[PDB]
Design a protein around this ligand. Structure first.
Ligand SMILES: CCCCCCCCCCCCCC(=O)OC[C@H](COP(=O)(O)OCC(O)COP(=O)(O)OC[C@@H](COC(=O)CCCCCCCCCCCCC)OC(=O)CCCCCCCCCCCCC)OC(=O)CCCCCCCCCCCCC
Ligand code: BCL
Ligand code: BCL
Ligand SMILES: COC(C)(C)C/C=C/C(C)=C/C=C/C(C=O)=C/C=C/C(C)=C/C=C/C=C(C)/C=C/C=C(\C)CC/C=C(C)/C=C/C=C(\C)C(=O)O
Ligand SMILES: COC(C)(C)C/C=C/C(C)=C/C=C/C(C=O)=C/C=C/C(C)=C/C=C/C=C(C)/C=C/C=C(\C)CC/C=C(C)/C=C/C=C(\C)C(=O)O
Ligand SMILES: COC(C)(C)C/C=C/C(C)=C/C=C/C(C=O)=C/C=C/C(C)=C/C=C/C=C(C)/C=C/C=C(\C)CC/C=C(C)/C=C/C=C(\C)C(=O)O
Ligand SMILES: COC(C)(C)C/C=C/C(C)=C/C=C/C(C=O)=C/C=C/C(C)=C/C=C/C=C(C)/C=C/C=C(\C)CC/C=C(C)/C=C/C=C(\C)C(=O)O
Ligand SMILES: COC(C)(C)C/C=C/C(C)=C/C=C/C(C=O)=C/C=C/C(C)=C/C=C/C=C(C)/C=C/C=C(\C)CC/C=C(C)/C=C/C=C(\C)C(=O)O
Ligand SMILES: COC(C)(C)C/C=C/C(C)=C/C=C/C(C=O)=C/C=C/C(C)=C/C=C/C=C(C)/C=C/C=C(\C)CC/C=C(C)/C=C/C=C(\C)C(=O)O
Ligand SMILES: COC(C)(C)C/C=C/C(C)=C/C=C/C(C=O)=C/C=C/C(C)=C/C=C/C=C(C)/C=C/C=C(\C)CC/C=C(C)/C=C/C=C(\C)C(=O)O
Ligand SMILES: CCCCCCCCCCCCO[C@@H]1O[C@H](CO)[C@@H](O[C@H]2O[C@H](CO)[C@@H](O)[C@H](O)[C@H]2O)[C@H](O)[C@H]1O
Ligand SMILES: CCCCCCCCCCCCO[C@@H]1O[C@H](CO)[C@@H](O[C@H]2O[C@H](CO)[C@@H](O)[C@H](O)[C@H]2O)[C@H](O)[C@H]1O
Ligand SMILES: CCCCCCCCCCCCO[C@@H]1O[C@H](CO)[C@@H](O[C@H]2O[C@H](CO)[C@@H](O)[C@H](O)[C@H]2O)[C@H](O)[C@H]1O
Lengths: 4, 180, 49, 273, 40, 60, 39, 56, 39, 48, 40, 60, 48, 39, 39, 59, 49, 40, 39, 49, 39, 39
């Protein structure tokens, strides 16, 4: 969930 | 034709332009409070506040300071306008309010407010001529006269002071223009 | 229809039209170079491996 | 709209730059060339402040904070989102304040006034220029400037003071404070005196310079007189800003230790070492 | 101010001529463009 | 529409216009130069597939 | 003060200056778009 | 077109114009001078492929 | 106030000077572009 | 067509036309140098 | 002010001649360029 | 050409010019002295291949 | 064609042309030295 | 400002100088081309 | 102000002043380039 | 030579001397503050012994 | 041809030409010393081992 | 006070003579340079 | 009050004094260079 | 040719020429002392072991 | 300033001095070449 | 104001005062050099  | 100025154009914020000699008509920085009361300023005891020192025997020059009487007055064009021959004193707060200058180029004596006189070298030495940056030696001849020589009204004070104030813009044509 | 021009300085008209045409032509070329893949095929033809 | 006596004063002339080109009014305001440059820098600086608020964390007025760059950028322009914006706003500020002082000089010349007001304002500009130009330059990085934010600049003032452990002991700061306090006292006395002679108790005649002079002389033992009190108020108010500029420029560039230990020279004078 | 009808009437003739000239060149340009890379 | 120049002094409407456009242009350039997507001075040579795009957190 | 004749003359330059400026701006935007679209 | 000089005295424009362009040239040079890609006083010798690119 | 033929004389110099400056600046950009392109 | 030139200072025309051509020609050459890979092939011919 | 109808009529002749000279030199340039490196 | 000196006082323009050039010369010398590559008072004796250069882009 | 010089000043015209040629020649030479690998091959011929 | 009488005399030198300059350049390119041809 | 002949002679000194200044600067730049080039 | 008509020698001479006095004093103190030319403390070092600033690291 | 000098001043002309020649000669020498490896060979010839 | 046509005619003769001398000296200098170190 | 004689005479002193100073300073740089060269 | 000196001051001319020569000769010597390795060989001759 | 008949004499000596200077320098270079030739 | 007679007389006292000062200062420097050389 730090990035898409 | 007696209105002293006209608008430079019709737009809302435009300057006015004088129709005559503005130093004499009193326009711009040469203008005075034309409605001002034509009576002398008075002391707490009701005597005339501003009088030639000759007419109040209690006054004298402070011992360490130069006596201005007899000194030449040097005008804005570096010519000699005249010599100081009398001091006028404020009697409510003891100070010199005006020099009275005997003109070299005529018979008049005119008043010269102290705020328009600079001493050489800021007064640190020399102390032997008066410098009047505001007006040329010719323009001294039109300095407004007082009705009497022993008193001055609040209106005459305004007229005389306004005349010298106007010279910083109107004494020479170049003074009105920008530096660049 | 020529009466359209009567109010006008013809140099202002030529300035306005000349400005429009330079604009439209440049827009059309910038657009077309994107769509038609040209000069990109010209470049690739002479490019170095 | 104009004051009832104003129109005869609205002449041409007295400009420094531009001549007749901008020599006009807009409502009450005189414009002039430096009016045009004032509005330019004010507008550019203010909109860049709004842009600084937009990319920061809040629109809350008190909390907006446009900070200078990291010290690592030295005297270069930093990336705009990393403090370069503060640098551009600082140039606008310098341009706006300088334009304001020169516009004041043009107005004063048009009215035949002395140049006292522009030069008095120069004292404040000197303090600002010390804080954001001179002191950061002497320290070698623009990041030593204070941030633009209503309370974040007070955090800067707090932290700069405690960089010297006990900033009250700064000797130029003691003088600057004394001028600020003495100015406020003198302003209260001058205001009071003029009002109390011009607004005496009902049915009393209007007072005089003599009554003002007598009362003042019972307060301080000596007469200051009319021009003297305005010289004093100008000396005190401008001296406060000049000594402020001195007190901050010596903190860091010249003195780096705590300020209490500066006073060691007084303890070691040979008469009592 | 501006143009009389007389010079407007002759100015219009050049304007029409130039416009139709520009359109003719542009028409040839599109015929070449189409035969090179048809876009529909 | 030319009556604008009778209401207002054209000498100074035009100064106001040039001032307004200059301020506006500088604001927009400094805004874009503050962004990540349009910092052209440092990232201007990147093609659009390489150019930054801002997004919110993926909110898993 | 300028007449309605001078006002009409001045307005013509002002319109064509505006149009010429708007054209240059629109070309600049289309170059910017083809380089890096914002929508 | 020349009539703008009847509105604006050219000698008073040209001094203003020079100041604006002098400041603008200084601003643009300093913006470049402290960018990474264009800090030419320190990296001007690199050549175009070695010069920094602000990718992230 | 300046006469219209003085204004016309100055305008020719002012156009020519501006365009000469813009020409020199365009060559400066050509050199800068060749050394290190920004797009 | 010639009466289009009435009212006109010819030196402004040659100044404007001349500056346009310089701008146009510089743009076209820089573009063409990009597309045609020249002087890049010239440089590689004589580089070590 | 500026050119009279006579001066314009004379100026136009040289202006047109110079423009055609430029187009001719450019036409040679493109012909050589095309033979060197065709672009379509 | 010389009518520029009929528009403006030559004395003023000379003082304006010399002031600008003096400040410009001082700024450029300071910028160089403040750099790494051209801090000539300390490193002027280094040869052109040993004088500092700012870092390149990464390899990827 | 000569009368386009009417109302011009020859010392300006020669100042402009002279400056342009100086500029164009220097621009062309620094550009050419980049492409043609010269004086680089001269400096290579005399080296230690 | 030159008269057309002056312009006539001037123009003959200006043309001669231009043509001579192009001749010298033409030789320079011929020498350069035979030294290092660029197409 | 100044006479057009006095302007004419002043300009010649201002031109040659600017030229001598450019000349020294150009030599100084070539020396600097020979010591530590910046491109 | 006529520049001396536009400027009073009694002013010019002091202005020029003041400029040179400031410039000379600036250059001396800039050098004295450097490491290489801190000549009061280190002037007796030979030219090979005198400090030199850091080079390019090459790594 | 000489009409080109009419209305000039000899001391102005010689100042311009003289400054140009000094500049051009000095530049050409600085450049040439770089490209030709002289005096670098001269220095290497007499340098102490 | 500017150079007359006759002074110019006189000046031009010396100016050409100096220029030709300078070119001549430089011509020898380049010949000696070329035979010392050819650059093409 | 200046005169062209006063100006021309004073110019000689300023020129010769300036050049003599630059000569003494050139020796000072020769000495400084021989002691500790900065390139 | 001598007219080139008209309107000059001869004491300026000798001042400029003399100062130029002093500058040029010093520059030429310190350059030549660099290239020719002299007096460096002179010093090394009489230097102490 | 200097008249033609001063300048005519000044030129004669100035040439004489220059010729002497070049002669002394020619001996210097002849000696220098015989000591440490540089080509 | 000042006469040349005084101006020349006075310059003689300046020179002797100056020389005396420089003589003392140069002895003082050479003493300092002998005690602790700064190069
Ligand atoms: C921090 C503690 C110490 C903080 C210490 C802060 C001290 C601040 C003191 C000064 C503030 C007042 C300034 C002022 O009076 O300007 C004149 C102007 C107009 O009135 P006028 O001068 O008598 O008449 C002229 C006018 O009628 C016609 O003039 P003209 O036709 O030539 O020009 C056009 C008009 C158009 O009107 C305007 O543009 C007025 C816009 C005013 C906006 C700013 C208000 C700021 C209020 C701050 C107090 C507080 C507001 C909450 O007139 C003008 O162009 C006049 C231009 C005046 C420009 C003044 C700019 C002052 C900006 C001050 C910003 C201060 C920020 C702190 O006055 C006004 O418009 C009304 C002002 C009323 C006094 C403020 C009282 C507020 C009480 C609370 C709200 C009351 C609601 C009923
Ligand atoms: C009378 C003075 C007129 C003028 C009249 C002419 C005439 C007549 C001719 C040109 C030509 C040219 N003009 Mg024009 N031109 C003027 C002002 C300009 C300006 C400007 C900034 O104002 C520019 C950019 C130009 C540009 C140009 C070029 C396209 C070309 C010259 C070579 C070149 O590359 O020059 C680049 C330019 C500059 C950097 C500007 C300064 C230098 C130029 C060269 C000065 C112009 C006068 C010069 C003596 C022309 C000599 C032409 C020869 C007789 C053939 N001109 C002035 C206002 N010009 C020639 C042409 O059409 O060739 C195709 C031509 O025959
Ligand atoms: C009023 C006199 C003239 C003048 C007239 C002469 C004459 C005449 C001669 C020189 C010579 C020289 N001049 Mg001188 N010179 C002047 C001003 C200067 C200035 C200067 C800062 O203004 C400088 C740097 C020079 C520099 C020089 C040297 C290039 C050269 C050798 C002597 C020397 O170093 O003198 C440094 C300068 C000074 C100490 C001050 C100037 C006056 C003194 C007296 C020196 C020159 C005269 C010399 C002793 C005469 C010898 C006899 C002749 C050989 C027949 N001159 C003044 C303006 N100069 C000689 C030369 O050309 O040798 C190749 C030479 O014969
Ligand atoms: C990114 O975040 C934020 C920033 C927040 C986003 C939001 C941005 C926003 C809200 C932008 C709004 C923009 C805007 C809104 O309207 C913008 C509007 C712009 C406009 C109208 C521009 C008009 C320009 C006109 C020009 C240049 C005309 C020039 C005329 C010339 C050259 C001719 C001169 C010659 C003359 C006259 C002849 C004299 C004759 C005479 C005298 C004679 O004949 O007498
Ligand atoms: C790469 O992708 C993109 C960029 C998108 C690709 C697309 C590009 C596009 C769309 C390009 C369009 C180009 C174009 C379009 O029009 C280009 C148009 C070019 C033109 C018109 C050139 C004209 C040249 C004219 C010349 C040389 C004339 C010289 C005249 C002379 C010398 C005579 C001077 C006058 C005299 C002697 C009078 C004397 C008498 C006097 C004075 C008297 O009598 O008074
Ligand atoms: C690398 O990539 C890129 C950069 C893209 C590559 C491309 C570059 C391009 C496109 C370059 C184009 C260049 C160009 C274009 O036209 C170049 C054009 C050049 C021109 C015009 C040169 C003209 C020279 C003229 C000379 C030397 C004249 C001399 C005159 C003399 C001797 C006589 C003087 C007068 C006298 C004696 C008397 C007068 C009478 C008087 C006073 C009296 O009688 O009073
Ligand atoms: C960090 O990198 C950053 C900095 C950021 C990068 C950016 C750099 C930028 C933007 C630089 C800009 C440079 C620039 C312009 O823009 C530069 C412009 C330079 C100019 C124009 C120089 C002109 C010099 C002229 C001189 C020296 C004249 C000398 C001689 C004179 C005067 C004559 C003396 C004789 C007189 C007077 C007597 C005459 C007779 C008389 C009176 C008689 O006889 O009556
Ligand atoms: C290190 O880092 C940083 C600092 C950053 C690096 C950068 C440094 C920079 C930018 C340096 C710039 C230097 C510079 C630029 O201009 C330097 C310019 C220097 C100059 C102009 C020197 C000129 C000196 C002139 C002198 C000494 C004149 C003497 C004259 C004398 C003795 C005679 C007096 C005449 C009399 C008495 C009259 C008698 C007759 C009378 C009265 C009669 O006849 O009436
Ligand atoms: C190392 O790498 C680099 C540096 C690059 C290498 C390259 C270097 C280069 C390119 C150098 C070039 C040098 C050069 C070029 O020209 C050098 C030129 C030198 C010259 C001109 C020398 C001239 C000497 C003149 C002398 C000695 C005159 C003496 C006169 C005397 C004694 C006075 C007699 C009386 C007179 C006059 C009047 C009486 C008054 C009378 C009657 C009266 O008043 O009435
Ligand atoms: C270490 O780091 C830093 C500090 C940074 C390094 C750098 C330092 C720098 C830049 C230094 C610069 C120094 C300098 C530069 O010029 C120094 C210049 C010094 C000078 C000029 C000294 C001159 C002295 C002259 C004297 C003493 C004369 C005295 C005359 C007397 C007594 C006689 C009086 C008259 C009498 C008795 C009778 C009259 C009779 C009359 C009238 C009658 O009889 O009628
Ligand atoms: C209005 C006056 C304007 C004056 C000019 C100012 C500069 C603006 C130039 C705009 C044109 C740029 O044109 C563009 O140049 C680039 C430079 O990388 C070329 O790019 C191509 O060639 C270059 C070499 O030249 C290669 O290094 C590069 O990898 C390749 O992509 C493009 O193929 C070309 O389309
Ligand atoms: C270096 C940066 C700035 C750019 C400098 C200029 C570069 C380009 C110069 C090209 C030559 C321009 O040539 C110049 O043109 C103008 C009009 O355009 C001519 O004409 C102008 O002045 C003359 C003489 O006072 C007037 O009669 C005329 O009405 C006026 O327009 C000039 O007499 C001529 O000298
Ligand atoms: C106008 C007055 C100028 C005075 C300024 C003096 C400094 C400028 C010198 C100009 C001459 C060329 O510069 C000349 O270069 C050589 C090297 O090539 C220097 O030589 C010096 O450095 C080299 C290393 O490079 C050392 O090994 C050598 O011991 C030392 O003498 C000369 O000492 C110097 O004079």
């Amino acid at each position: 969930p730090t990035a898409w | 034709s007696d209105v002293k100025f006209v608008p430079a154009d019709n737009y809302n914020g435009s300057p006015i332009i004088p129709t005559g000699n503005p130093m004499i008509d009193g326009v711009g920085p040469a203008s005075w409070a034309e409605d001002r009361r034509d009576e002398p300023d008075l002391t707490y005891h009701g005597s005339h506040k501003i009088v030639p020192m000759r007419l109040d025997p209690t006054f004298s020059i402070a011992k360490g300071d130069p006596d201005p009487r007899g000194l030449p007055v040097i005008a804005a064009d570096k010519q000699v306008a005249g010599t100081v021959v009398e001091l006028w004193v404020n009697r409510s707060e003891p100070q010199v309010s005006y020099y009275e200058v005997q003109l070299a180029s005529g018979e008049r004596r005119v008043l010269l407010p102290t705020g328009y006189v600079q001493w050489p070298n800021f007064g640190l030495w020399g102390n032997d001529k008066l410098l009047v940056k505001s007006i040329t030696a010719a323009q001294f001849a039109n300095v407004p006269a007082t009705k009497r020589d022993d008193q001055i009204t609040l209106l005459e004070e305004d007229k005389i002071c306004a005349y010298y104030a106007g010279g910083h813009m109107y004494a020479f044509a170049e003074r009105s223009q920008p530096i660049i | 229809m020529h009466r359209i021009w009567m109010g006008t300085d013809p140099h202002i008209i030529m300035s306005a039209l000349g400005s429009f045409l330079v604009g439209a032509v440049l827009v059309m070329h910038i657009w077309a170079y994107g769509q038609f893949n040209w000069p990109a095929t010209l470049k690739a033809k002479y490019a170095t491996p | 709209a104009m004051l009832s006596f104003e129109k005869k004063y609205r002449v041409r002339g007295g400009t420094l730059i531009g001549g007749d080109l901008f020599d006009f009014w807009f409502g009450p305001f005189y414009v002039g060339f430096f009016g045009v440059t004032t509005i330019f820098f004010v507008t550019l600086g203010t909109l860049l402040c709004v842009w600084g608020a937009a990319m920061g964390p809040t629109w809350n007025l008190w909390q907006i904070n446009i900070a200078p760059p990291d010290l690592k950028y030295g005297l270069g322009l930093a990336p705009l989102r990393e403090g370069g914006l503060w640098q551009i706003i600082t140039l606008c500020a310098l341009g706006a304040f300088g334009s304001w002082a020169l516009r004041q000089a043009e107005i004063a010349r048009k009215l035949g006034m002395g140049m006292h007001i522009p030069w008095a304002y120069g004292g404040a500009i000197l303090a600002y220029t010390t804080l954001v130009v001179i002191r950061p330059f002497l320290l070698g990085a623009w990041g030593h400037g204070f941030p633009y934010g209503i309370f974040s600049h007070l955090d800067w003032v707090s932290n700069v003071g405690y960089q010297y452990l006990h900033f009250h002991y700064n000797p130029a700061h003691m003088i600057a404070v004394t001028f600020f306090f003495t100015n406020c006292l003198a302003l209260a006395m001058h205001g009071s005196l003029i009002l109390s002679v011009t607004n005496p108790p009902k049915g009393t005649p209007t007072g005089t310079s003599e009554q003002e002079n007598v009362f003042f002389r019972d307060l301080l033992g000596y007469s200051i007189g009319a021009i003297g009190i305005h010289r004093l108020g100008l000396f005190l108010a401008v001296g406060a800003a000049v000594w402020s500029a001195i007190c901050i420029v010596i903190s860091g560039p010249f003195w780096t230790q705590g300020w209490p230990e500066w006073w060691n020279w007084w303890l070691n004078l040979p008469i009592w070492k | 101010g501006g143009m009389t009808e007389e010079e407007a009437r002759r100015f219009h003739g050049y304007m029409v001529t130039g416009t139709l000239g520009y359109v003719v060149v542009a028409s040839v340009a599109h015929f070449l463009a189409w035969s090179w890379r048809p876009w529909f | 529409m030319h009556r604008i120049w009778l209401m207002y002094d054209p000498r100074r409407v035009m100064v106001a216009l040039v001032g307004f456009l200059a301020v506006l242009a500088l604001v927009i350039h400094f805004v874009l130069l503050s962004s990540q997507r349009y910092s052209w001075i440092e990232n201007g040579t990147l093609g659009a597939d390489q150019a930054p795009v801002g997004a919110s957190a993926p909110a898993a």
